[PDB]
Each structure stands twice: as C-alpha cells, then as structure tokens.
Amino acid sequence: MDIIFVSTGNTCRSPMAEALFKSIAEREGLNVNVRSAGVFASPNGKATPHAVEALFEKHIALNHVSSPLTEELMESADLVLAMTHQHKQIIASQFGRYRDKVFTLKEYVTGSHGDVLDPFGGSIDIYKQTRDELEELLRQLAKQLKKDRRLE
C-alpha cells in the first residue's frame, strides 16, 4: 500500500506521477501512501515550472520538495516504480536488499518493457504529453492495485 515513484532528479516525472496518482487514488477510494524520490536528487528542489504548469491545467497543485532515495524509504515501501530501466538498475545497485519490490512503471502496469522518457528541459507540450502518458498508466495502476489485498 506504500508506493514510491522514482526518477532521476525527482523534479519532473516522479513528482507528477505522485500528484496524479494521489488524485486518482482518492477518487477511487484506494488506501495508499504515495511518495516520490530521485536516484540523483538534490533536495530543497521544487518541481520544475513546466511540471507544475502541466498539472495545474488539470486542477492539481503540484507542491513538492525534491528528495533523495534513502534506505529508510526503500524499506517501508511495498512497491517501488521506476520511470526507466536504467533507474531500476541504479536503484538495484544501491539498495540491493530491496530489489524484489522494484519494477518499471510500464512493466508493472502493462507487462511491456518501456520507459517513461525524460521531459527535463523540454517545452510545455513535452510536459503535457508526459502528463498524459503518466495519467493513462496511473489510471490502470489504480484499477490493478484495487485487487491487492495488501491495501488492507
């Protein structure tokens, strides 16, 4: 029931995923704790302006503080969903004890190997396309988690 989304900087995809998923899960009455982290994150970080603007259009306020992935986070998580395969492997090399909870978002939800590509430095339309890709995956993730008895 404790889910963590992980990207590189924890400024774009992963905070977007966390905010979109919180919104979706609350609509559906899922019992989840949602967090996000970055494998190379410098905290004190806000989400990027385009990430914030992309969610703002969907009436979601992306108020976020960037955070590094910690051993404490890895331990409390039931599921760790990485944006790309490279993230998955980086997490696995640093937190090998917890590899069994780490999957890419696309592989966990769709069964397909695929990455959620980095929008950083891109235009607002790049971010809106990332938002839309994420929302689709996350709506499916929400329906799937409904069947997980770990939701208590």
Side-chain angles (χ1 to χ4, degrees), residues 41-67:
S42 65
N44 180 274
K46 305 185 179 185
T48 61
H50 283 160
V52 170
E53 175 183 346
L55 291 196
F56 194 82
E57 308 320 313
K58 297 295 178 186
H59 312 82
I60 297 175
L62 178 51
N63 205 343
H64 174 71
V65 169
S66 291
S67 307

PDB file of all heavy atoms in Angstrom, residues 41-67:
ATOM      1  N   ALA A  41      18.904  13.015  -6.771  1.00  0.00           N
ATOM      2  CA  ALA A  41      18.142  14.191  -6.404  1.00  0.00           C
ATOM      3  C   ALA A  41      18.917  15.059  -5.434  1.00  0.00           C
ATOM      4  O   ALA A  41      19.603  14.561  -4.538  1.00  0.00           O
ATOM      5  CB  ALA A  41      16.808  13.791  -5.799  1.00  0.00           C
ATOM      6  N   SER A  42      18.814  16.365  -5.633  1.00  0.00           N
ATOM      7  CA  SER A  42      19.254  17.323  -4.636  1.00  0.00           C
ATOM      8  C   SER A  42      17.990  17.884  -4.013  1.00  0.00           C
ATOM      9  O   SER A  42      17.212  18.554  -4.693  1.00  0.00           O
ATOM     10  CB  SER A  42      20.058  18.451  -5.279  1.00  0.00           C
ATOM     11  OG  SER A  42      19.244  19.216  -6.155  1.00  0.00           O
ATOM     12  N   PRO A  43      17.766  17.605  -2.718  1.00  0.00           N
ATOM     13  CA  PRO A  43      16.572  18.130  -2.043  1.00  0.00           C
ATOM     14  C   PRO A  43      16.591  19.654  -1.982  1.00  0.00           C
ATOM     15  O   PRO A  43      17.553  20.263  -2.464  1.00  0.00           O
ATOM     16  CB  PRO A  43      16.654  17.532  -0.635  1.00  0.00           C
ATOM     17  CG  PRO A  43      17.663  16.461  -0.710  1.00  0.00           C
ATOM     18  CD  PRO A  43      18.593  16.773  -1.829  1.00  0.00           C
ATOM     19  N   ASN A  44      15.543  20.236  -1.395  1.00  0.00           N
ATOM     20  CA  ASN A  44      15.252  21.676  -1.448  1.00  0.00           C
ATOM     21  C   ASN A  44      14.639  22.008  -2.799  1.00  0.00           C
ATOM     22  O   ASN A  44      14.155  23.113  -3.037  1.00  0.00           O
ATOM     23  CB  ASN A  44      16.490  22.539  -1.135  1.00  0.00           C
ATOM     24  CG  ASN A  44      16.209  24.029  -1.195  1.00  0.00           C
ATOM     25  OD1 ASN A  44      16.280  24.643  -2.260  1.00  0.00           O
ATOM     26  ND2 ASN A  44      15.905  24.621  -0.045  1.00  0.00           N
ATOM     27  N   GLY A  45      14.631  21.008  -3.671  1.00  0.00           N
ATOM     28  CA  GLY A  45      14.159  21.187  -5.021  1.00  0.00           C
ATOM     29  C   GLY A  45      12.654  21.263  -5.120  1.00  0.00           C
ATOM     30  O   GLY A  45      11.935  20.417  -4.582  1.00  0.00           O
ATOM     31  N   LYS A  46      12.177  22.297  -5.802  1.00  0.00           N
ATOM     32  CA  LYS A  46      10.793  22.335  -6.232  1.00  0.00           C
ATOM     33  C   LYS A  46      10.663  21.468  -7.481  1.00  0.00           C
ATOM     34  O   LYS A  46      11.657  21.158  -8.142  1.00  0.00           O
ATOM     35  CB  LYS A  46      10.376  23.766  -6.577  1.00  0.00           C
ATOM     36  CG  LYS A  46      10.598  24.789  -5.472  1.00  0.00           C
ATOM     37  CD  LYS A  46      10.043  26.155  -5.880  1.00  0.00           C
ATOM     38  CE  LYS A  46      10.219  27.193  -4.777  1.00  0.00           C
ATOM     39  NZ  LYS A  46       9.562  28.485  -5.124  1.00  0.00           N
ATOM     40  N   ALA A  47       9.438  21.079  -7.809  1.00  0.00           N
ATOM     41  CA  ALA A  47       9.171  20.532  -9.129  1.00  0.00           C
ATOM     42  C   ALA A  47       9.498  21.612 -10.169  1.00  0.00           C
ATOM     43  O   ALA A  47       9.440  22.817  -9.871  1.00  0.00           O
ATOM     44  CB  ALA A  47       7.719  20.114  -9.228  1.00  0.00           C
ATOM     45  N   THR A  48       9.846  21.208 -11.388  1.00  0.00           N
ATOM     46  CA  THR A  48      10.105  22.213 -12.424  1.00  0.00           C
ATOM     47  C   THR A  48       8.839  22.991 -12.752  1.00  0.00           C
ATOM     48  O   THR A  48       7.732  22.463 -12.632  1.00  0.00           O
ATOM     49  CB  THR A  48      10.616  21.593 -13.725  1.00  0.00           C
ATOM     50  OG1 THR A  48       9.621  20.702 -14.227  1.00  0.00           O
ATOM     51  CG2 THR A  48      11.919  20.832 -13.485  1.00  0.00           C
ATOM     52  N   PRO A  49       9.000  24.247 -13.176  1.00  0.00           N
ATOM     53  CA  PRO A  49       7.847  25.079 -13.533  1.00  0.00           C
ATOM     54  C   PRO A  49       6.931  24.430 -14.570  1.00  0.00           C
ATOM     55  O   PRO A  49       5.723  24.540 -14.425  1.00  0.00           O
ATOM     56  CB  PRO A  49       8.499  26.340 -14.099  1.00  0.00           C
ATOM     57  CG  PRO A  49       9.770  26.450 -13.310  1.00  0.00           C
ATOM     58  CD  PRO A  49      10.253  25.025 -13.149  1.00  0.00           C
ATOM     59  N   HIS A  50       7.477  23.759 -15.582  1.00  0.00           N
ATOM     60  CA  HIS A  50       6.607  23.126 -16.575  1.00  0.00           C
ATOM     61  C   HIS A  50       5.839  21.928 -16.014  1.00  0.00           C
ATOM     62  O   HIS A  50       4.699  21.681 -16.411  1.00  0.00           O
ATOM     63  CB  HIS A  50       7.367  22.751 -17.850  1.00  0.00           C
ATOM     64  CG  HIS A  50       7.657  23.913 -18.742  1.00  0.00           C
ATOM     65  ND1 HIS A  50       8.647  23.886 -19.704  1.00  0.00           N
ATOM     66  CD2 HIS A  50       7.097  25.145 -18.814  1.00  0.00           C
ATOM     67  CE1 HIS A  50       8.689  25.052 -20.323  1.00  0.00           C
ATOM     68  NE2 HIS A  50       7.755  25.833 -19.806  1.00  0.00           N
ATOM     69  N   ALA A  51       6.457  21.196 -15.088  1.00  0.00           N
ATOM     70  CA  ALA A  51       5.753  20.106 -14.411  1.00  0.00           C
ATOM     71  C   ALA A  51       4.568  20.675 -13.629  1.00  0.00           C
ATOM     72  O   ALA A  51       3.454  20.153 -13.695  1.00  0.00           O
ATOM     73  CB  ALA A  51       6.685  19.357 -13.471  1.00  0.00           C
ATOM     74  N   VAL A  52       4.815  21.758 -12.897  1.00  0.00           N
ATOM     75  CA  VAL A  52       3.752  22.380 -12.112  1.00  0.00           C
ATOM     76  C   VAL A  52       2.623  22.879 -13.017  1.00  0.00           C
ATOM     77  O   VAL A  52       1.441  22.658 -12.738  1.00  0.00           O
ATOM     78  CB  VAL A  52       4.295  23.539 -11.258  1.00  0.00           C
ATOM     79  CG1 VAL A  52       3.136  24.338 -10.635  1.00  0.00           C
ATOM     80  CG2 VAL A  52       5.240  22.995 -10.187  1.00  0.00           C
ATOM     81  N   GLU A  53       2.997  23.526 -14.114  1.00  0.00           N
ATOM     82  CA  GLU A  53       2.040  24.112 -15.053  1.00  0.00           C
ATOM     83  C   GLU A  53       1.193  23.024 -15.724  1.00  0.00           C
ATOM     84  O   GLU A  53      -0.022  23.159 -15.877  1.00  0.00           O
ATOM     85  CB  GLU A  53       2.805  24.917 -16.105  1.00  0.00           C
ATOM     86  CG  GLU A  53       1.965  25.491 -17.224  1.00  0.00           C
ATOM     87  CD  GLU A  53       2.820  26.213 -18.254  1.00  0.00           C
ATOM     88  OE1 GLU A  53       4.004  26.482 -17.946  1.00  0.00           O
ATOM     89  OE2 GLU A  53       2.319  26.496 -19.366  1.00  0.00           O
ATOM     90  N   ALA A  54       1.838  21.930 -16.110  1.00  0.00           N
ATOM     91  CA  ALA A  54       1.119  20.791 -16.691  1.00  0.00           C
ATOM     92  C   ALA A  54       0.030  20.205 -15.777  1.00  0.00           C
ATOM     93  O   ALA A  54      -1.055  19.869 -16.246  1.00  0.00           O
ATOM     94  CB  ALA A  54       2.108  19.699 -17.111  1.00  0.00           C
ATOM     95  N   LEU A  55       0.309  20.073 -14.480  1.00  0.00           N
ATOM     96  CA  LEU A  55      -0.703  19.560 -13.558  1.00  0.00           C
ATOM     97  C   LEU A  55      -1.741  20.623 -13.217  1.00  0.00           C
ATOM     98  O   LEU A  55      -2.931  20.319 -13.031  1.00  0.00           O
ATOM     99  CB  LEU A  55      -0.070  19.033 -12.278  1.00  0.00           C
ATOM    100  CG  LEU A  55       0.759  17.757 -12.472  1.00  0.00           C
ATOM    101  CD1 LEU A  55       1.010  17.085 -11.146  1.00  0.00           C
ATOM    102  CD2 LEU A  55       0.062  16.821 -13.425  1.00  0.00           C
ATOM    103  N   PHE A  56      -1.289  21.871 -13.154  1.00  0.00           N
ATOM    104  CA  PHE A  56      -2.170  22.986 -12.845  1.00  0.00           C
ATOM    105  C   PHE A  56      -3.352  23.030 -13.816  1.00  0.00           C
ATOM    106  O   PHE A  56      -4.489  23.306 -13.419  1.00  0.00           O
ATOM    107  CB  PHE A  56      -1.388  24.303 -12.904  1.00  0.00           C
ATOM    108  CG  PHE A  56      -2.114  25.471 -12.295  1.00  0.00           C
ATOM    109  CD1 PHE A  56      -2.092  25.681 -10.925  1.00  0.00           C
ATOM    110  CD2 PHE A  56      -2.797  26.370 -13.096  1.00  0.00           C
ATOM    111  CE1 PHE A  56      -2.756  26.777 -10.366  1.00  0.00           C
ATOM    112  CE2 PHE A  56      -3.461  27.470 -12.545  1.00  0.00           C
ATOM    113  CZ  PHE A  56      -3.434  27.665 -11.182  1.00  0.00           C
ATOM    114  N   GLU A  57      -3.084  22.736 -15.085  1.00  0.00           N
ATOM    115  CA  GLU A  57      -4.134  22.731 -16.107  1.00  0.00           C
ATOM    116  C   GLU A  57      -5.204  21.684 -15.814  1.00  0.00           C
ATOM    117  O   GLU A  57      -6.364  21.841 -16.196  1.00  0.00           O
ATOM    118  CB  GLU A  57      -3.549  22.496 -17.505  1.00  0.00           C
ATOM    119  CG  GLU A  57      -2.413  23.428 -17.892  1.00  0.00           C
ATOM    120  CD  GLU A  57      -2.626  24.865 -17.433  1.00  0.00           C
ATOM    121  OE1 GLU A  57      -3.734  25.412 -17.636  1.00  0.00           O
ATOM    122  OE2 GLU A  57      -1.673  25.451 -16.869  1.00  0.00           O
ATOM    123  N   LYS A  58      -4.808  20.616 -15.133  1.00  0.00           N
ATOM    124  CA  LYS A  58      -5.744  19.574 -14.738  1.00  0.00           C
ATOM    125  C   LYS A  58      -6.281  19.797 -13.325  1.00  0.00           C
ATOM    126  O   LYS A  58      -6.852  18.891 -12.721  1.00  0.00           O
ATOM    127  CB  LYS A  58      -5.083  18.198 -14.845  1.00  0.00           C
ATOM    128  CG  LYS A  58      -4.674  17.830 -16.266  1.00  0.00           C
ATOM    129  CD  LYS A  58      -5.886  17.691 -17.163  1.00  0.00           C
ATOM    130  CE  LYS A  58      -5.492  17.381 -18.597  1.00  0.00           C
ATOM    131  NZ  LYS A  58      -6.681  17.385 -19.492  1.00  0.00           N
ATOM    132  N   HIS A  59      -6.078  21.005 -12.803  1.00  0.00           N
ATOM    133  CA  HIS A  59      -6.578  21.386 -11.484  1.00  0.00           C
ATOM    134  C   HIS A  59      -5.956  20.555 -10.358  1.00  0.00           C
ATOM    135  O   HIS A  59      -6.614  20.198  -9.386  1.00  0.00           O
ATOM    136  CB  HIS A  59      -8.111  21.342 -11.456  1.00  0.00           C
ATOM    137  CG  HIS A  59      -8.744  22.033 -12.623  1.00  0.00           C
ATOM    138  ND1 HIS A  59      -8.889  21.432 -13.855  1.00  0.00           N
ATOM    139  CD2 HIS A  59      -9.248  23.284 -12.754  1.00  0.00           C
ATOM    140  CE1 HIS A  59      -9.466  22.277 -14.690  1.00  0.00           C
ATOM    141  NE2 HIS A  59      -9.695  23.408 -14.047  1.00  0.00           N
ATOM    142  N   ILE A  60      -4.669  20.257 -10.507  1.00  0.00           N
ATOM    143  CA  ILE A  60      -3.881  19.628  -9.451  1.00  0.00           C
ATOM    144  C   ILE A  60      -2.715  20.547  -9.096  1.00  0.00           C
ATOM    145  O   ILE A  60      -2.000  21.016  -9.989  1.00  0.00           O
ATOM    146  CB  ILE A  60      -3.310  18.278  -9.917  1.00  0.00           C
ATOM    147  CG1 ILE A  60      -4.446  17.303 -10.237  1.00  0.00           C
ATOM    148  CG2 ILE A  60      -2.344  17.711  -8.871  1.00  0.00           C
ATOM    149  CD1 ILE A  60      -3.960  15.980 -10.811  1.00  0.00           C
ATOM    150  N   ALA A  61      -2.556  20.847  -7.807  1.00  0.00           N
ATOM    151  CA  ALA A  61      -1.454  21.687  -7.350  1.00  0.00           C
ATOM    152  C   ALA A  61      -0.249  20.815  -7.011  1.00  0.00           C
ATOM    153  O   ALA A  61      -0.286  20.020  -6.072  1.00  0.00           O
ATOM    154  CB  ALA A  61      -1.878  22.510  -6.136  1.00  0.00           C
ATOM    155  N   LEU A  62       0.815  20.959  -7.786  1.00  0.00           N
ATOM    156  CA  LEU A  62       1.993  20.118  -7.608  1.00  0.00           C
ATOM    157  C   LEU A  62       2.939  20.840  -6.657  1.00  0.00           C
ATOM    158  O   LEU A  62       3.844  21.557  -7.083  1.00  0.00           O
ATOM    159  CB  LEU A  62       2.662  19.877  -8.957  1.00  0.00           C
ATOM    160  CG  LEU A  62       3.951  19.040  -8.924  1.00  0.00           C
ATOM    161  CD1 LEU A  62       3.738  17.756  -8.162  1.00  0.00           C
ATOM    162  CD2 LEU A  62       4.457  18.767 -10.338  1.00  0.00           C
ATOM    163  N   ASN A  63       2.688  20.702  -5.363  1.00  0.00           N
ATOM    164  CA  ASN A  63       3.552  21.329  -4.379  1.00  0.00           C
ATOM    165  C   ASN A  63       4.460  20.260  -3.819  1.00  0.00           C
ATOM    166  O   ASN A  63       4.005  19.308  -3.189  1.00  0.00           O
ATOM    167  CB  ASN A  63       2.748  22.024  -3.279  1.00  0.00           C
ATOM    168  CG  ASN A  63       3.524  23.145  -2.621  1.00  0.00           C
ATOM    169  OD1 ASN A  63       4.750  23.220  -2.747  1.00  0.00           O
ATOM    170  ND2 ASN A  63       2.820  24.021  -1.912  1.00  0.00           N
ATOM    171  N   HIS A  64       5.750  20.405  -4.083  1.00  0.00           N
ATOM    172  CA  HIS A  64       6.663  19.288  -3.930  1.00  0.00           C
ATOM    173  C   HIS A  64       8.037  19.728  -3.454  1.00  0.00           C
ATOM    174  O   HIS A  64       8.533  20.785  -3.834  1.00  0.00           O
ATOM    175  CB  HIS A  64       6.791  18.558  -5.266  1.00  0.00           C
ATOM    176  CG  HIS A  64       7.808  17.467  -5.266  1.00  0.00           C
ATOM    177  ND1 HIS A  64       7.627  16.282  -4.588  1.00  0.00           N
ATOM    178  CD2 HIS A  64       9.022  17.379  -5.862  1.00  0.00           C
ATOM    179  CE1 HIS A  64       8.683  15.509  -4.764  1.00  0.00           C
ATOM    180  NE2 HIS A  64       9.542  16.150  -5.537  1.00  0.00           N
ATOM    181  N   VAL A  65       8.640  18.905  -2.608  1.00  0.00           N
ATOM    182  CA  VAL A  65      10.024  19.098  -2.215  1.00  0.00           C
ATOM    183  C   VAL A  65      10.824  17.874  -2.658  1.00  0.00           C
ATOM    184  O   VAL A  65      10.529  16.753  -2.235  1.00  0.00           O
ATOM    185  CB  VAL A  65      10.156  19.298  -0.689  1.00  0.00           C
ATOM    186  CG1 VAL A  65      11.616  19.239  -0.269  1.00  0.00           C
ATOM    187  CG2 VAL A  65       9.517  20.628  -0.270  1.00  0.00           C
ATOM    188  N   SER A  66      11.813  18.097  -3.523  1.00  0.00           N
ATOM    189  CA  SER A  66      12.670  17.020  -4.039  1.00  0.00           C
ATOM    190  C   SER A  66      13.366  16.269  -2.910  1.00  0.00           C
ATOM    191  O   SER A  66      13.710  16.857  -1.887  1.00  0.00           O
ATOM    192  CB  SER A  66      13.727  17.577  -4.999  1.00  0.00           C
ATOM    193  OG  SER A  66      13.135  18.030  -6.199  1.00  0.00           O
ATOM    194  N   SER A  67      13.579  14.972  -3.106  1.00  0.00           N
ATOM    195  CA  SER A  67      14.137  14.131  -2.054  1.00  0.00           C
ATOM    196  C   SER A  67      14.942  12.974  -2.638  1.00  0.00           C
ATOM    197  O   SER A  67      14.540  12.357  -3.626  1.00  0.00           O
ATOM    198  CB  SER A  67      13.013  13.569  -1.170  1.00  0.00           C
ATOM    199  OG  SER A  67      12.170  14.599  -0.671  1.00  0.00           O
TER     200      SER A  67
END
